[PDB]
Structure 1
Amino acid sequence: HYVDWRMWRDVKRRKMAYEYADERLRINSLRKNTILPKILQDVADEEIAALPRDSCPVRIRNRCVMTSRPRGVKRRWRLSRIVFRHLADHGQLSGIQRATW
């Protein structure tokens, strides 16, 4: 029930990236290492490469939440400032308002 298809793209990417993380971290740690020759390093590289596409946090693009709008989006609030700015103007945000100084 998302607006644009980029929303579903990013949702699937995030899901398939969060599916597996233990092996990813293990192989990332095994990579950068002076111990053990390059044999096991290349073996682990081929293993991590054998994984399917999509399943990867690299493809995750932190956009907004309305219709995927990566334009000054705040990851702390996820959703863009489309409605957040409206609230900050009205006053529906406990604190987040115009910097009165």
Structure 2
Amino acid sequence: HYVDWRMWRDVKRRKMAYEYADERLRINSLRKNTILPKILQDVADEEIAALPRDSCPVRIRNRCVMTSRPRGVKRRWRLSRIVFRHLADHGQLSGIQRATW
């Protein structure tokens, strides 16, 4: 029942990345050192590449939790600028007020 298909894709990607975070962490740790043999590093590289694409953490997009806007999303509140402005103007966000100085 997510906002849109793009949000659904993002949710699936987040689930998968969380699921495979540990294995990616370990394999990337193997790849990211100058100590181990380079042959071992190469096999680690091919393996990490062989992991499913959607598990890549970078593929996660921080969309607005409410309207699925892919840009202009404040991380602290996870709300697009439009929705954040709506709520703040209606005074529904604690401690947020129009700035003047």
Is the Cα contact below 8 Å between 1:13 and 1:55 reproduced in 2?
yes
CA offset at residue 72 of structure 1?
1.3
Per the normalisation by structure 1, the TM-score is 0.86
- Measure, in 2, the Cα distance between the counterparts of 1:83 and 1:18: 27
Residue segments in structure 2 that go unaligned for 5+ positions in a row: none
Residues 27-51 of structure 1 show CA distances to partners (whole Å, capped at 9, x for unaligned) of 2222121212211101111121221
CA offset at residue 100 of structure 1?
3.2
Is the Cα contact below 8 Å between 2:28 and 2:48 reproduced in 1?
no
Runs of 4+ with >3 A deviation: none
Per the normalisation by structure 2, the TM-score is 0.86
Residue segments in structure 1 that go unaligned for 5+ positions in a row: none
Give the number of equivalent residue pairs. 101
Is the Cα contact below 8 Å between 1:63 and 1:69 reproduced in 2?
yes
- Measure, in 1, the Cα distance between the counterparts of 2:16 and 2:95: 36
Query: Which structure's relative contact order is higher, taking Cα pairs within 8 Å and 6+ residues apart?
Result: 1
Residues 17-76 of structure 1 show CA distances to partners (whole Å, capped at 9, x for unaligned) of 000212211122221212122111011111212212212212111121233212311121
What RMSD over aligned residues (CA atoms) do the two structures have, in Å? 1.6
CA offset at residue 81 of structure 1?
2.6
- Measure, in 2, the Cα distance between the counterparts of 1:75 and 1:53: 25
